[PDB]
Design a protein around this ligand. Structure first.
Ligand code: PPE
Ligand code: PPE
Lengths: 335, 335
């Protein structure tokens, strides 16, 4: 039957919302370009330049795509040979790295991080043979911490002329000083993923970026879809990336950080809450006493969180996205 | 260097506009959903149901994606094993079939059509070994003619339990009675590509569809991106696919067909115009005397067409998209 014609790997491979790391409030935007009958630019000029000014890079070092998710796929499609090359990631982390490789047909090499979520440098150096792309989320999802920049430098020296190192900075707006965007001059093999889905409050736009050196970007352009971005998305993205939009964005980051600190202080006092881990993002990882029990309870109360109990070493943990003061108080009361 | 890390195939692999088959006039649309902070549905309910009513299929037989282009890729990603499986197409036709396979790493089997653009059935039957997906554009781009339904039935009998047959109906709105959408009940391996880019006048939305049986659609869902469509695109798409939107669309089809007939009558009278081929779409293929000479001339006059002189058997031909009466008269006068 039809199913027998599909590739073997393809055969084998939810919706108070505080589970997807979205900004809790909707920032309104309206269209300004009524040119829907014509195909859009392959890489919207206004979007690429506005983002390059914001990120502090050159326009030729930016690539716009359908979220950071498409960015993850592009890197594998351009550098990894199916059945020959490997990808490497360090659990517990964002699940789309292995899903894309599994869907495409590339092998996964996993080197779990140390107990403090930091990189197991010696383990990575031992499993690099055959690896073409290394993904590192910093700050990490779901744990919330930054990877020591000194260890990142070591990772970069290890992969020079061997593999591409991709730093997922989907949550960098929360700790802007920790960005590796300035390292592009020093490292040809460094690529960074960015997005408008979190701090920018535009998850519905499906708009992301890849920051890398001209050489890498030019290669990715060869594997990307002819018109990866719609005109309405490029329209709103340029409005959100204007100087006033970047000011409003920072106001949002501020509000979330303040609220995050309140939520962390309150959670520590709660008995069932065994441990609250520090974060430099818009979510909090916390180990609970009988996590799935409390998860179901809140779930039945209309408080949607994200269970991480199945993740390597995240037994008993739930990931809570930071929302409004009313939503935080709602989770506090329920606990 | 960086380039040496890329896959071998990746290393090796323009903007009066009448060159992209777009509707000449912009139909205005405005947003109605200010929920941009939240991730969109993976498959927008309103879009899938409105399109299913229009196309006359069941909602479970529809898949919405970023244009018919993503639809072409999905089929190869789900059914073709890189380095093992093959794709088959019949030149001269739409160029994205071979580009997607070349980018992914799948081999192309080409069986050029007969002199009248119809399918070389015996040639296809001889090159089917190893083929997993067969693409057939009907009506064809750039020639404009329909593939004999009797030959399509033969193609379908030849591929039963061997390969998926995909009918590209990107231009079907111009000859709706010629659609193979009703054949889904009879053929499990039949898939159809649709789009909002032409008659629907929404090329800027990057919104397309794949019509197939539940089994095929469920497999494609496994290889597609988590949120392939943005909220603003799903918003406008549902507005355009409402009963009133389908009525307005048909008005557009009517206007284009009438204009097409005018443009064909006028072109025949012109001396340099050697031959004008009949079309069931929104473009016209025509063989000219010194085609690149006339192409450059019009190009220098701000009249942009599409050169097909390099396509197999399309030597001396230019593809002219049907626009407004003023644009047609502008091309007539220039000739
Ligand atoms: C680390 C990380 N990297 C990349 C992305 C991709 O973002 P985008 O630009 O939207 O493609 C995400 C979103 N992961 C969130 C997905 C939520 C959802 O799917 O819904 C998450 O983990 O909550 C990440 O958490
Ligand atoms: C036969 C055919 N099939 C599929 C598509 C894909 O459409 P979409 O839904 O937008 O992805 C196109 C557009 N081909 C036009 C592309 C114009 C452009 O790239 O610009 C064309 O040939 O003019 C086709 O001509």
């Amino acid at each position: 039957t039809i199913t027998d014609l599909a590739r073997e790997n393809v055969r084998n491979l939810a919706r108070v919302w505080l589970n997807a790391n979205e900004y809790p409030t909707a920032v309104e935007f309206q269209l300004t370009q009524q040119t829907l009958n014509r195909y859009p630019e392959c890489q919207p000029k206004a979007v690429i330049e506005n983002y390059a000014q914001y990120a502090g890079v050159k326009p030729e070092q930016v690539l716009v795509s359908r979220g950071a998710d498409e960015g993850i796929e592009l890197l594998i499609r351009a550098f990894c040979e199916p059945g020959k090359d490997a990808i490497l990631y360090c659990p517990p982390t964002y699940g789309m790295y292995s899903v894309s490789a599994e869907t495409i047909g590339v092998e996964c090499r996993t080197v779990p991080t140390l107990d403090n979520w930091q990189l197991d440098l010696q383990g990575i150096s031992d499993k690099l043979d055959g690896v073409k792309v290394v993904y590192v989320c910093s700050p990490n999802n779901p744990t919330g911490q930054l990877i020591n920049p000194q260890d990142f430098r070591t990772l970069l020296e290890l992969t020079r002329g061997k593999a591409i190192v991709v730093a997922d900075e989907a949550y960098i707006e929360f700790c802007p000083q920790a960005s590796l965007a300035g390292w592009l001059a020093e490292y040809p093999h460094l690529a960074i993923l960015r997005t408008l889905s979190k701090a920018f409050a535009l998850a519905g736009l499906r708009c992301g970026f890849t920051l890398a050196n001209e050489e890498v970007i030019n290669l990715l352009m060869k594997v990307i879809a002819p018109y990866p971005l719609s005109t309405p998305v490029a329209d709103i993205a340029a409005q959100a990336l204007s100087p006033q939009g970047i000011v409003a964005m920072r106001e949002r980051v501020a509000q979330i950080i303040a609220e995050r600190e309140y939520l962390i202080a309150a959670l520590k006092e709660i008995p069932c809450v065994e441990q609250v881990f520090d974060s430099e993002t818009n979510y909090i990882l916390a180990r609970f006493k009988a996590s799935s029990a409390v998860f179901k309870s809140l779930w039945d109360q209309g408080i949607i969180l994200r269970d991480q109990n199945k993740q390597p070493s995240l037994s008993g943990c739930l990931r809570i996205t930071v929302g409004t003061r009313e939503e935080s108080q709602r989770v506090i009361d329920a606990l």
